[PDB]
Amino acid sequence: RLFKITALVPSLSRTRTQRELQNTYFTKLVPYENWFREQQRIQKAGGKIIKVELATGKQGTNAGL
Amino acid sequence: TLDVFTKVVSQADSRGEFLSNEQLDALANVVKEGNKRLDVVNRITSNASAIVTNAARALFEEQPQLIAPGGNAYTNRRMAACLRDMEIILRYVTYAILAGDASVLDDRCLNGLRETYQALGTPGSSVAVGVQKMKDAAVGIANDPNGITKGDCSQLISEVASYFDRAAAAVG
Amino acid sequence: TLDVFTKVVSQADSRGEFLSNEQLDALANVVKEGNKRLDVVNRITSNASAIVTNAARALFEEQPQLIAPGGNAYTNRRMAACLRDMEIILRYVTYAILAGDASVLDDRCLNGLRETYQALGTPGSSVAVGVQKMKDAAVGIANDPNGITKGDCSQLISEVASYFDRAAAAVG
Amino acid sequence: QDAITAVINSADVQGKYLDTAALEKLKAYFSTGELRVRAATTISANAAAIVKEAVAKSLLYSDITRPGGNMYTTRRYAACIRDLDYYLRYATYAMLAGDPSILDERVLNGLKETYNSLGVPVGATVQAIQAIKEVTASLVGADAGKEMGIYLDYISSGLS
Amino acid sequence: QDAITAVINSADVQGKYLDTAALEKLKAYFSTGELRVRAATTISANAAAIVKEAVAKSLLYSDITRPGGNMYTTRRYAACIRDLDYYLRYATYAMLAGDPSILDERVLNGLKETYNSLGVPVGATVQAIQAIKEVTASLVGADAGKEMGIYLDYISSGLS
Amino acid sequence: VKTPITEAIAAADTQGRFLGNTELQSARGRYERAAASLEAARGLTSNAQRLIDGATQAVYQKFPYTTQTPGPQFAADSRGKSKCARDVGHYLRIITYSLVAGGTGPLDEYLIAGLAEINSTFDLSPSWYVEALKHIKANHGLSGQAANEANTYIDYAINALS
Amino acid sequence: KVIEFLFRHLLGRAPATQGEIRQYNKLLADNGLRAAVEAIVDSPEYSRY
Amino acid sequence: IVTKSIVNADAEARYLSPGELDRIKSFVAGGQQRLRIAQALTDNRERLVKQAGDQLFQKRPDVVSPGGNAYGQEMTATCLRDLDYYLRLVTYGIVAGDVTPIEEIGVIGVREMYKSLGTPIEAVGEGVRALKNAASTLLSAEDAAEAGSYFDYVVGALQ
Amino acid sequence: IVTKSIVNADAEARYLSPGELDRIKSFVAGGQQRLRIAQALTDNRERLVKQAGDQLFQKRPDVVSPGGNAYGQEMTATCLRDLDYYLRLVTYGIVAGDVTPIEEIGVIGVREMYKSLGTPIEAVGEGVRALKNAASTLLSAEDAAEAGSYFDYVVGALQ
Amino acid sequence: SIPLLEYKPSSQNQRVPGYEVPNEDTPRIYRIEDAAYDSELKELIWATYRQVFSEHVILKFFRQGNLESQLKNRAISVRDFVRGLAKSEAFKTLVIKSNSNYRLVELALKRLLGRAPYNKDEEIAWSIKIATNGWDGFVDALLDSEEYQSNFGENIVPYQRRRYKDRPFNLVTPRYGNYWRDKLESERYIEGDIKNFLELAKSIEIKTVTFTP
Ligand SMILES: *[C@H](C)[C@H]1/C(=C/c2[nH]c(/C=C3N=C(/C=C4\NC(=O)C(CC)=C4C)C(C)=C\3CCC(=O)O)c(CCC(=O)O)c2C)NC(=O)[C@@H]1C
Ligand SMILES: CCC1=C(C)/C(=C/C2=NC(=C\c3[nH]c(/C=C4\NC(=O)[C@H](C)[C@H]4CC)c(C)c3CCC(=O)O)/C(CCC(=O)O)=C2C)NC1=O
Ligand SMILES: CCC1=C(C)/C(=C/C2=NC(=C\c3[nH]c(/C=C4\NC(=O)[C@H](C)[C@H]4CC)c(C)c3CCC(=O)O)/C(CCC(=O)O)=C2C)NC1=O
Ligand SMILES: CCC1=C(C)/C(=C/C2=NC(=C\c3[nH]c(/C=C4\NC(=O)[C@H](C)[C@H]4CC)c(C)c3CCC(=O)O)/C(CCC(=O)O)=C2C)NC1=O
Ligand SMILES: CCC1=C(C)/C(=C/C2=NC(=C\c3[nH]c(/C=C4\NC(=O)[C@H](C)[C@H]4CC)c(C)c3CCC(=O)O)/C(CCC(=O)O)=C2C)NC1=O
Ligand SMILES: CCC1=C(C)/C(=C/C2=NC(=C\c3[nH]c(/C=C4\NC(=O)[C@H](C)[C@H]4CC)c(C)c3CCC(=O)O)/C(CCC(=O)O)=C2C)NC1=O
Ligand SMILES: CCC1=C(C)/C(=C/C2=NC(=C\c3[nH]c(/C=C4\NC(=O)[C@H](C)[C@H]4CC)c(C)c3CCC(=O)O)/C(CCC(=O)O)=C2C)NC1=O
Ligand SMILES: CCC1=C(C)/C(=C/C2=NC(=C\c3[nH]c(/C=C4\NC(=O)[C@H](C)[C@H]4CC)c(C)c3CCC(=O)O)/C(CCC(=O)O)=C2C)NC1=O
Ligand SMILES: CCC1=C(C)/C(=C/C2=NC(=C\c3[nH]c(/C=C4\NC(=O)[C@H](C)[C@H]4CC)c(C)c3CCC(=O)O)/C(CCC(=O)O)=C2C)NC1=O
């Protein structure tokens, strides 16, 4: 139900003067429904995905998630 | 060793649900055709030894090289192996007719016959002819009405022709 | 059937020399830990039937399809196979703990278990899981001190956890 | 997940339908669900008094509420009240579901690492959860009290 | 990245310009790019029929599509269709680039951990990708079929 | 399995002889017995829900401690009572199996083989299912010759429990 | 108007052109407001702006 | 109805409402009748599925036409298995009181699935409507209103 | 191709690229041949539409079956009009070089439309494939590659 | 009647003398005439169950009350007692329904004679006798064989003769065969299949009309 993600996304636009440490490197909990498109956004931005982990869910659950 | 009844039982057993009414109705029909099943099984074992010798002569004419020297059924000892073992098809066929199922036929008389011949040198082709020469005479013995009441058993005699065809095609 | 002693004997027989001094120093340590070996083995057989039923319920919950119909352990005869049998792992494990060697465990309870299941249809993995549910309870039964003198046997209990892991990994 | 959805999921992994064993489990769940509803009302009555009595019995006048403790600061005390309150609310939810997996997936997912990283003591939380268990067992009743205590002890065992 | 940008990056790490060896690689890439365009059209024609024939050849009427399998549920079946549709689309992109690094960076970054965490079987996906490879090799042609199969086998080797 | 058709078959197999009139008369005896036994099975399959509800409640009122005593073996929790209707729901299948098969084959192969073997281990008292079957014996509601046919297999299971 | 409220609360800009209102009508109608909110936070303009 | 009430009170910060606790009490009170309806539908699995499928082929002969999807014994067996699956999900929804078991097992992604299978959606829907009519004829009257309204959810959600 | 290049350089902050200006120059250079292909397809409107529709009814007789949608003279006339519309959009896409005229006139919401009309999508797609085959036989060879690849976009986008 | 099929014997651990003087891992091969007690006969009656059935199928329901009583009385010789277990229809349903004829040779040699079969051609050799003589007649010819009566003798429980490094036979051979297992997978009752709906799909009548234009 909840994924534990950890990914880096570099800056391929112009360089930013704000620190932006979190954007470059983050670890966040994403729900299962949003995770496909949110991954696809990191897929688009050319960033590496380091660590994917199921936080809450169990594999192979047919009912009740 | 399975029946028509225990066929339905072991099929309903896996599901874990009690047998349906429709299935039961079908088994009530097997009770009604139960007396015709004893008509057909009693007619074969009465003509058992007469149909072994009669199918043997028609086999050993039409393949003369068997009792000719060098043949697989040449000497008097092997010849009795073949002649008397033609009962063992009929022993396990009339078991399956009275059972109404081909489970007893499969694990005794069918499970290793096509196995045992490569080590034995008995030709596979010869077996197909011999049992198939039993089938047209065993059906013809149970077909004709003489001193029995007339009925219809074409849906039941086709089971017997299926049993020999199961016994024939599993070897040759 | 080999010991820790006859392990050293048959190894020293192959080289054909006398028994060295440190081997007798090592076997003198087995004499000192000999009384700790007796207590652990004795404890298991006192809790033998209690750990068979307790590991069975934890197995048949977490794989419910076994005692469900169609499963390999569905019927009682089969079920009294998978349940009583679970003693036979423990029969040959506590032999090996009192022997101190895995030779008796190997040629009786390990030599054909991964063999016999392909012809049987029993699931090897499920059996392996069951033995791994024995191991964390058999170690936990011998671990706790209640009415015995306190000692240290972590170098000896690890032999027992190795024996179940030898019994588990040889099948699944 | 409920007890009903747990029964349905167990039968679905088997691939069969709901026959008499699962039906008897469902009848059992319905019979206890009546008193479960009554206990949910009587717990939602005075949840604040339950948390107040629990912290007054267990956490107050100790070293952790003194200067040099985890509950010294006013924001830390409010986080303790909220945390204690959450354990009561999710134990109520797990009581009404008849199933602790929703409770586990909700809080016991990450609360171990959170209390590890923040330096929150575990055993004081276990004592506070036990005090909640005693207060709710005294307030509600015997059998609904132990039904509440099963999931509260599940929380306390998951944190430990 | 392309084959062109790969050639440029290799020459840039060397620090030299594009002389005759790199130019001959570029002429080779142009000569195969014609049939690559024709194969992209004939793949984008009937991608749905390719995925349909692949799942009908490989995944249907098995234990995973039966109750008690990974593809039993309707949302799981739709996720399977969209994953095979992806593998075909990204193998088309990697065919037109002439370079598998964009394909690797796109999907093989995290699909291993995702199929690990969700419990998705790997070998059934490898069989499905092989069925896609056979269907596209029968549909497109010989040399463009094996050009497609190189990147499809790259996907199947990256998942394994 | 054991069936008086196959009882006639396996007896003629060991002697190595054909199906004479000795084995043949055992068949009809099974055949006309089914017509008083198949609607004896229809009386149980139609009343399936009634009896497993009736026998389970009859056990609790006979043994009132089995609902209160804490243990896995007992019916204190919900999963005990869920396993309660599974067990007596499993008994009524085999009785309908052994009525339809016409012999004690399915009672032998599926229920009573190792039945005294498991009850020593899981401390399930067999007198629990004795009172369970005796409620089914009195509440079946069957009448006539067919009823008598459904009455023996209930009593054949009771003597196997004891 | 819900769509302009969404673009204003999450971003502060609210509509740019009629066509994005068109493309958000379908996202509202298929599942509800939550799918359209997730489509707003999926959009690359949120990450740039 | 417990899961839906809990997640609805989860979206808010508050507990379960007295109204919702009345809903759970009424659901418990009607649960035994719902188990009786599930008992009848479990035991009538065969003939309900066959009558509904044959009513479908009476209404829609396009599927069993040789240009259609359900042409042949194996294809029509899978057709009847699909109707069996949907009747099983209807029994789950009658027992639970929610439609979340019906939804997340068989509704949520079925359009894209039957688009990729080549199967028409409307014939599935007409078959489930035939199941609704058959199970309405089998059961008691307002009990059939209860069963047919879950069937009605499945029919309206498939189209 | 000018609109797509302009909106693509609009998403960035920069002007049109030299690569994109080469694309526009090559599109201008091929534009006269594209007008010739549009001339041939305009003048072959009748027989192309009729041959493609009759090839469709040879392949798929379900639509003109009496259970099907295109049963009757008026329904089959609207079928041929739909094929006429799609051939017109294919000519627009051949002229423009983009597929944005094909898309925003006839692709973008066609699945929901033909779902609500009761019409199968795959038979539309098979008819446009028949149009592709017919217009491929009429034109010059690599000119037919050009026409059939826009037809290929329409076919793949309908399914 | 007819003499048996002539079979070549292979090299086997018991066929020859071996100079093991009593090794420990060798069985305790029991005798009836030692007993003189209540006590000894309960262990002896258990080891013959452990041989012929197997440990797993040694449950109380299968066991025969009449046979056990006879051994204590001593009316029947242990060699006459093993005939009870081999011709027991409680034994016969467990092994003859589930095993083919050639496996029935091998299982009887492996347990009763306590020896491995020599070759394949001798299970073929014993096979003809079983079909004609029945299961009881083949067992009767095995126990009255000269090989069985000389080596086990008259009152000694079956056991494996020589196993220097050889598998125990109970472990080595399953009660049932590899064939009968494949039937159990075939009648598993798969769930959610198209095959169980095939007999229902042919009963439904479907009429299709095609229009050509
Ligand atoms: C007959 C049409 C052909 C034929 C028969 C034949 N067979 C043998 C030898 C054997 N036959 C069997 C057959 C069975 N054994 C079984 O257990 C069963 C099922 C119950 C069957 C059908 C076996 C095992 C043998 C091996 C020896 C034996 O009798 O025990 C012979 C004798 C051959 C010989 O002695 O070398 C013969 C003549 N052979 C033919 O020529 C016919 C074509
Ligand atoms: C405000 C606190 C803070 C810091 C310091 C910070 C650093 C930071 N440096 C980065 C990259 C980088 N950092 C460097 C730095 C160097 N290269 C060298 O050879 C030198 C050793 C060193 C320069 C002195 C380079 C070259 C990159 C880009 C590498 C790439 O192309 O991916 C990135 C990745 C995204 C990016 O900016 O491109 C972050 C987040 N972020 C923060 O929030
Ligand atoms: C076990 C001892 C036993 C036997 C043998 C037996 C046979 C038997 N066969 C019968 C009928 C019959 N049997 C047959 C059989 C056939 N007619 C044909 O033309 C076919 C070729 C053939 C089947 C292949 C028929 C047609 C009837 C008519 C009556 C009926 O349906 O039973 C009946 C009805 C009652 C009667 O005849 O008095 C009896 C008794 N009943 C017994 O108790
Ligand atoms: C001394 C070493 C030794 C072992 C361990 C051994 C096992 C063994 N277990 C067997 C059967 C069996 N084994 C099991 C056990 C299981 N099946 C299940 O469903 C469970 C998953 C699992 C237990 C956890 C069962 C139930 C049977 C009976 C199966 C049958 O009769 O077809 C059989 C074949 C029949 C038999 O004689 O009982 C052997 C040979 N034999 C040996 O000589
Ligand atoms: C064959 C029958 C038999 C048994 C069972 C037996 C056990 C046994 N264990 C003993 C001691 C002992 N046994 C243990 C065992 C342990 N303590 C721990 O804390 C560990 C967890 C565990 C080992 C894993 C210890 C620590 C002692 C102390 C005395 C000694 O060293 O023997 C002794 C010393 C004498 C006595 O206790 O009266 C006996 C008798 N003796 C026998 O004749
Ligand atoms: C574009 C590059 C890319 C890919 C490929 C991708 C895959 C991907 N597949 C997923 C799930 C899934 N993937 C499968 C796949 C399969 N099941 C099987 O048995 C087969 C072996 C295999 C189908 C051929 C299934 C069944 C799920 C859903 C499992 C669940 O219910 O949680 C998920 C989790 C969210 C979801 O879609 O439901 C992602 C992110 N994401 C991406 O960004
Ligand atoms: C197919 C034929 C068949 C039947 C019927 C069968 C019953 C059976 N019931 C068991 C346990 C049980 N049986 C019951 C049933 C009851 N206990 C009670 O308190 C009630 C009085 C009663 C129900 C009315 C319960 C609650 C358990 C679990 C007990 C435990 O885990 O210790 C067990 C041992 C553990 C198991 O696998 O679940 C078996 C083998 N097994 C079979 O193979
Ligand atoms: C529990 C939720 C669930 C559903 C609904 C489901 C459907 C389902 N239908 C299938 C095939 C099929 N489904 C149909 C269906 C139909 N024939 C028609 O024309 C009618 C409109 C419709 C009958 C309702 C046909 C004809 C096939 C065979 C198509 C093929 O084999 O390509 C298949 C692939 C083969 C299989 O695994 O059985 C699945 C998975 N699976 C599920 O797990
Ligand atoms: C330019 C983009 C565009 C398209 C595509 C379009 C289609 C379109 N098709 C229609 C009907 C129809 N369309 C078909 C189509 C077909 N018969 C089949 O089976 C085949 C799969 C398919 C032929 C390709 C049929 C049979 C009808 C009549 C349905 C009715 O009258 O209800 C209608 C309603 C009546 C009308 O206004 O003509 C529209 C608007 N309109 C548009 O503006």
3-state secondary structure string, chain G? CHHHHHHHHHCCCCCCCHHHHHHHHHHHHHCCHHHHHHHHHHCHHHHHC
Whole-angstrom distance, CA of residue E131 vs CA of residue E87: 12
E157: left (phi over 0), alpha (psi -120 to 50) or beta: alpha
- The 3-state DSSP class for residue A7 equals strand
Q: Flag whether B touches E (3+ CB pairs, 8 A cutoff).
A: no
Q: Do J131 and B88 touch (CB under 8 A)?
A: yes
Residue with tokens 């086999």: B59
Q: Compute and round to an integer the Cα radius of gyration of chain G.
A: 10
CA torsion G32-H95-F94-C58 (nearest 10°) is 70
Q: How many CB atoms lie within 10 A of CB E77?
A: 22
Does residue H139 contact residue H40 with C-beta atoms inside 8 Å?
Answer: yes
Q: Which tokens sit at H149? A: 């309204």
Whole-angstrom distance, CA of residue J182 vs CA of residue J188: 10
F16: left (phi over 0), alpha (psi -120 to 50) or beta: left
CA of D103 to nearest chain H CA: how many angstroms apart? 12
Amino acid letter, residue J62:
F
Does residue B88 contact residue B109 with C-beta atoms inside 8 Å?
Answer: yes
Q: Which helix (H) or strand (E) holds A3?
A: strand A2-8
Ligand 4 center to C81 CA (angstroms)? 5
Q: How many CB atoms lie within 10 A of CB C26?
A: 12
Residue with tokens 């009743």: D141
* Ligand 7 binding pocket includes F70 (Cβ within 6 Å): no
Ligand 6 center to E80 CA (angstroms)? 6
Of I149, I153, I156, the CB nearest to E46: I156
Strand order in the sheet with A2-8: A25-31, A2-8, A49-54
Q: How many CB atoms lie within 10 A of CB A42?
A: 18
* Ligand 4 binding pocket includes C161 (Cβ within 6 Å): no
**Nearest ligand for residue A18 CA:** 2
Residues from chain I that touch J213, judged by Cβ atoms under 8 A, are 54, 57, 64, 76
Residues constituting chain H: 159
Whole-angstrom distance, CA of residue E124 vs CA of residue G1: 48
CA of E63 to nearest chain D CA: how many angstroms apart? 12
Question: Which residue in J120, J100, J35, J107 sits closest to J74, CA to CA?
Answer: J35
CA of E1 to nearest chain H CA: how many angstroms apart? 32
Q: Do J177 and C119 touch (CB under 8 A)?
A: yes
Residue B109 assigned as binding residue? no
Q: Which helix (H) or strand (E) holds A2?
A: strand A2-8
Q: How many CB atoms lie within 10 A of CB J202?
A: 12
Question: Which residue in H125, H116, H154, H133 sits closest to H63, CA to CA?
Answer: H125
Q: Do E81 and H108 touch (CB under 8 A)?
A: no
Does residue D53 contact residue D134 with C-beta atoms inside 8 Å?
Answer: no
Give start and end residues of each alpha helix (H) in chain B.
5-15, 21-32, 34-46, 48-62, 76-99, 103-109, 113-116, 124-143, 154-169
Please list the residues that pair with A6 across neighbouring strands.
A27, A51
Task: Please give the number of the atom of ligand 2 that sits closest to the Cα of A23.
Answer: 40
Residues from chain H that touch J206, judged by Cβ atoms under 8 A, are 57, 61, 63-65, 70, 76
List chains touching H (3+ CB pairs under 8 A).
Answer: A, B, D, E, I, J
Whole-angstrom distance, CA of residue H25 vs CA of residue D24: 19
Testing the interface with C: which of B9, B11, B13, B18 to mutate, by most C Cβ within 10 A?
B13
Residue with tokens 């399915």: F106
Ligand 8 center to J183 CA (angstroms)? 28
Please list the residues that pair with J48 across neighbouring strands.
none
Task: Please give the number of the atom of ligand 2 that sits closest to the Cα of A8.
Answer: 34
Q: Which tokens sit at I32? A: 């006269």
* CA-CA-CA-CA torsion sign (B122, B124, B128, B129): negative
Question: Which residue in J125, J118, J134 sits closest to J102, CA to CA?
Answer: J125
Q: Do J135 and F13 touch (CB under 8 A)?
A: yes
* Ligand 3 binding pocket includes B40 (Cβ within 6 Å): yes
Inter-axis angle of helices F21-34 and B34-46, to 10 degrees? 170
Residue with tokens 């046979």: J67
Q: Flag whether J touches G (3+ CB pairs, 8 A cutoff).
A: no
- The 3-state DSSP class for residue A5 equals strand
Report which protein residue has its CA nearest ligand 3's atom 41.
B35
Residues from chain F that touch D20, judged by Cβ atoms under 8 A, are 49, 52, 85-86, 89
Residues constituting chain J: 213
Testing the interface with J: which of C66, C111, C113, C117 to mutate, by most J Cβ within 10 A?
C111
Please list the residues that pair with A30 across neighbouring strands.
A3
Does residue I130 contact residue I51 with C-beta atoms inside 8 Å?
Answer: yes
Question: Which residue in C97, C85, C95 sits closest to C55, CA to CA?
Answer: C85
Centroid of chain to Cα J28? 21
Question: Which residue in J4, J3, J6 sits closest to J119, CA to CA?
Answer: J6
- The 3-state DSSP class for residue D118 equals helix
Ligand 7 center to F83 CA (angstroms)? 6
Whole-angstrom distance, CA of residue B79 vs CA of residue J148: 31
Does residue D5 contact residue H29 with C-beta atoms inside 8 Å?
Answer: no
Q: How many CB atoms lie within 10 A of CB E63?
A: 15
- The 3-state DSSP class for residue D133 equals helix
CB crowding I46-55: b at 16 or more within 10 Å, else e = eebbebbbeb
Does residue I133 contact residue I51 with C-beta atoms inside 8 Å?
Answer: no
Q: Which residues of I are annotated as a binding site for (2R,3E)-phycocyanobilin?
A: 79
Please list the residues that pair with B81 across neighbouring strands.
none
Ligand 2 center to D117 CA (angstroms)? 28
Question: Which residue in F143, F125, F141, F103 sits closest to F59, CA to CA?
Answer: F125
Question: Which residue in E109, E108, E152 sits closest to E127, CA to CA?
Answer: E152
Ligand 4 center to C54 CA (angstroms)? 19
Q: What is the DSSP string of J113-174?
A: S-S--S-SHHHHHHHHHHHHHHHHHHHHHHHTSHHHHHHT-SSB----S--SS---HHHHS-
Comparing alpha-carbon positions, the chain F residue that sits nearest to B33 is F31
Does residue J81 contact residue J48 with C-beta atoms inside 8 Å?
Answer: yes
CB crowding I118-140: b at 16 or more within 10 Å, else e = ebbeebbbbbbbbbbbbbeebbe
Does residue D32 contact residue D137 with C-beta atoms inside 8 Å?
Answer: no
Q: Which tokens sit at E130? A: 């092989």
Looking from the CA of C149 toward its CB, the CA atoms found within 13 Å total 4
Amino acid letter, residue H4:
K
Q: Which helix (H) or strand (E) holds I46?
A: helix I45-59
Contacts for A37 with CB less than 8 Å, ≥ 6 apart:
G38, G42
Whole-angstrom distance, CA of residue C97 vs CA of residue C138: 12
Inter-axis angle of helices D74-97 and H2-11, to 10 degrees? 160
Looking from the CA of D59 toward its CB, the CA atoms found within 13 Å total 28
Residue with tokens 């071996």: J18
Q: Is residue J179 less than 8 Å (CB to CB) from chain B? A: yes
Whole-angstrom distance, CA of residue A49 vs CA of residue E113: 10
The DSSP call for residue B69 is: T
Q: Which tokens sit at H35? A: 């188990």
Q: What is the resolution of this structure in A?
A: 3.9
Does residue D140 contact residue D148 with C-beta atoms inside 8 Å?
Answer: yes
Whole-angstrom distance, CA of residue C120 vs CA of residue J106: 17
Please name the method used to determine this structure: cryo-EM
Residue D25, CA distances (Å) to B162, D2, D19, D30, F83 in order: 49, 12, 10, 9, 8
Question: Which residue in B114, B53, B40 sits closest to B82, CA to CA?
Answer: B53
Q: Flag whether A touches J (3+ CB pairs, 8 A cutoff).
A: no
Chain A residues 20-39 with CB within 8 Å of chain D = 29
* Ligand 7 binding pocket includes C75 (Cβ within 6 Å): yes
Q: Which helix (H) or strand (E) holds A54?
A: strand A49-54
Whole-angstrom distance, CA of residue H23 vs CA of residue H18: 9
Q: What is the DSSP string of E97-157?
A: HT-SHHHHHHTTTTHHHHHHHHT--HHHHHHHHHHHHHHHHHHT-SHHHHHHHHHHHHHHH
Residues from chain J that touch E67, judged by Cβ atoms under 8 A, are 191-192
Q: Do J194 and E61 touch (CB under 8 A)?
A: yes
List chains touching F (3+ CB pairs under 8 A).
Answer: B, C, D, J
Whole-angstrom distance, CA of residue J176 vs CA of residue J173: 8
Q: Which helix (H) or strand (E) holds A53?
A: strand A49-54
Task: Please give the number of the atom of ligand 8 that sits closest to the Cα of H62.
Answer: 19
Pairing of strands A2-8, A25-31: antiparallel
CB crowding C102-125: b at 16 or more within 10 Å, else e = bbbbbbbbbbbbeebbebbbbbbe
Q: Do D1 and A64 touch (CB under 8 A)?
A: yes
Does residue B170 contact residue B109 with C-beta atoms inside 8 Å?
Answer: no
Looking from the CA of H63 toward its CB, the CA atoms found within 13 Å total 29
Question: Which residue in H24, H33, H26, H32 sits closest to H142, CA to CA?
Answer: H33
Pairing of strands A49-54, A2-8: antiparallel
Does residue B105 contact residue B92 with C-beta atoms inside 8 Å?
Answer: yes
Q: Which helix (H) or strand (E) holds A27?
A: strand A25-31
Q: Do A63 and H3 touch (CB under 8 A)?
A: no
Whole-angstrom distance, CA of residue F110 vs CA of residue F103: 13
Q: Compute and round to an integer the Cα radius of gyration of chain J.
A: 24
Whole-angstrom distance, CA of residue B124 vs CA of residue C147: 76
Question: Which residue in D154, D137, D25 sits closest to D93, CA to CA?
Answer: D154
Residue H48, CA distances (Å) to E144, F155, H132, H158, J47 in order: 52, 37, 9, 20, 57
